[PDB]
Design a protein around this ligand. Structure first.
Ligand SMILES: [Zn+2]
Length: 81
């Protein structure tokens, strides 16, 4: 149920923001010793009607990339228009 994409991101940008046409509510953050960098947890602004969740973290393989993982598919059009 998950799709992962890779977003090259300036290394000085630690905000864990991936712009994707949709709106998000950040609800969680995880910090762990296996990644030097936090993981941010978001739910779609159309929650609970929309089930999509989004997790963003720097790649531990290529730290020039953010890894954005989306769970679910949006059941609505993107509100950033
Ligand atoms: Zn949605």
């Amino acid at each position: 149920n998950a799709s992962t994409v890779y977003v090259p991101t300036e290394t000085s940008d630690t905000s864990l923001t991936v712009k994707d046409g949709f709106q998000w509510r950040k609800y969680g953050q995880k910090v762990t010793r296996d990644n030097p960098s936090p993981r941010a947890y978001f739910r779609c602004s159309f929650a609970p009607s929309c089930p999509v969740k989004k997790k963003v973290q720097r790649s531990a393989e290529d730290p020039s990339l953010l890894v954005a993982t989306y769970e679910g598919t949006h059941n609505h059009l993107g509100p950033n228009a």
